[PDB]
Design an enzyme around this catalytic site. Structure first.
Site, mmCIF file in Angstrom:
data_model
loop_
_atom_site.group_PDB
_atom_site.id
_atom_site.type_symbol
_atom_site.label_atom_id
_atom_site.label_comp_id
_atom_site.label_asym_id
_atom_site.label_seq_id
_atom_site.Cartn_x
_atom_site.Cartn_y
_atom_site.Cartn_z
ATOM 1 N N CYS A 105 0.845 -1.191 0.000
ATOM 2 C CA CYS A 105 0.000 0.000 0.000
ATOM 3 C C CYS A 105 0.891 1.256 0.000
ATOM 4 O O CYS A 105 1.609 1.461 -1.001
ATOM 5 C CB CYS A 105 -1.100 -0.086 1.065
ATOM 6 N N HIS A 125 0.019 1.369 -3.527
ATOM 7 C CA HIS A 125 -1.342 1.829 -3.767
ATOM 8 C C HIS A 125 -1.288 2.921 -4.848
ATOM 9 O O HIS A 125 -0.351 3.740 -4.857
ATOM 10 C CB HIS A 125 -1.945 2.446 -2.510
HETATM 11 C C1 LIG Z 1 -3.383 1.793 1.865
HETATM 12 O O1 LIG Z 1 -3.458 1.028 3.038
HETATM 13 C C2 LIG Z 1 -2.550 2.912 1.902
HETATM 14 O O2 LIG Z 1 -1.442 2.956 2.457
HETATM 15 N N1 LIG Z 1 -3.096 3.845 1.104
HETATM 16 C C3 LIG Z 1 -2.527 5.203 0.771
HETATM 17 C C4 LIG Z 1 -4.345 3.498 0.807
HETATM 18 C C5 LIG Z 1 -5.331 4.200 0.225
HETATM 19 C C6 LIG Z 1 -6.604 3.633 0.065
HETATM 20 C C7 LIG Z 1 -6.879 2.367 0.567
HETATM 21 C C8 LIG Z 1 -5.822 1.668 1.182
HETATM 22 C C9 LIG Z 1 -4.596 2.250 1.289
#
Ligand SMILES: *[C@@]1(=O)C(=O)N([C])C2=[C][C]=[C][C]=C21
Ligand SMILES: *[C@@]1(=O)C(=O)N([C])C2=[C][C]=[C][C]=C21
Lengths: 187, 187
Positions: A105, A125
């Protein structure tokens, strides 16, 4: 000998990205240490799930090195990992010894912060791509899981099973990963 | 008014099946209470992840009723839910008021224990089918998520996102579920 995994747990970590790999790795017979960045106390994850670490990072570091170091995502979790000198030391040591480093992510942005694995192909991500790619130090991928050099990356909560199973495959082999996968009722 | 979810957390619960629905429901703006069956203390899940509940079940019951009651799986978690008179009372109340009841993996076997929703079409983890079907009180389904009458069921860790999103759809509608889904990077 059982393989060993260090999962670094910071405030604001994405709890799904923490728990899915911990659980799946334990199903594979990997000895997993959930290590609290801040100490031994419970950690408030991004969506307010509170997880009690197995140990402080300070204490877990003494029991290293590990066959994999795992960095969950969550923007604020990843920021905390990125700001940590202890994390820097752990990742540098792991890279120096050619051990696996896995991040999901926004987690891979801590690799950028700590100058780890430059030149590798990586994913993140979608919302973390621009941060990861500042300076063009990595090559970007849209694969759900990407592996290049030492460096295993993945995209989000919805790629967490794939990410975890890729760790399992790297450490324990394809047949163990397949055996762990089947009872999960994955698509 | 925000919808409200009660997630009942027992020793031996499957931590992925606990955390994925809690997280996804919170992403949907649902007010989720993680309620400890045994009290306020931290709960040792099936794969040794330790989660601190928001409240004891005893205390959370006082703040009912809820728009959904959620039963995670894990064999030993589900057994603990099945043996609980407090769980029986909560589920009976929820059924009597025609509120949603959601259970995953072995979780639906607690519905059998507490005589909830007999006649409904249900799924479970494949390994929990025979237990669920003792007496033929439900009709069995192999769908990844099944919904019939009051009763929303699902199969395993690998169906947890689908299960959680089905809860979201039931409570907050299809468009909210779609909006919550997109950033997760699901298949
Ligand atoms: C992740 O867990 C993350 O780090 N990011 C930036 C993100 C954005 C939307 C959904 C999950 C995640
Ligand atoms: C579920 O969490 C569960 O309750 N059961 C029986 C099961 C078996 C294998 C994998 C997951 C699960």
């Amino acid at each position: 000998a059982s393989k060993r995994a260090l999962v670094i747990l910071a405030k604001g970590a994405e709890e799904m990205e923490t728990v899915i790999p911990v659980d799946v790795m334990r199903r594979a017979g990997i000895k997993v240490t959930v290590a609290g960045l801040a100490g031994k106390d419970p950690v408030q994850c991004s969506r307010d799930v509170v997880i009690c670490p197995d140990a402080s990072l300070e204490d877990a570091k003494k029991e290293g090195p590990y066959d994999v170091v795992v960095l969950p995502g969550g923007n604020l979790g990843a920021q905390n990992l990125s700001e940590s000198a202890a994390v820097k030391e752990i990742l540098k040591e792991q890279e120096n010894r050619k051990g696996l480093i896995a991040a999901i992510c926004a987690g891979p942005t801590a690799l950028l912060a700590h100058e780890i694995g430059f030149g590798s192909k990586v994913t993140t991500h979608p919302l973390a791509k621009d941060k990861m790619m500042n300076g063009g130090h990595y090559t970007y991928s849209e694969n759900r899981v990407e592996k290049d050099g030492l460096i295993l990356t993945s995209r989000g909560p919805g790629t967490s099973f794939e990410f975890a199973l890729a760790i399992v495959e790297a450490l324990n082999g394809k047949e163990v990963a397949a055996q762990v996968k089947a009872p999960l009722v994955l698509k």
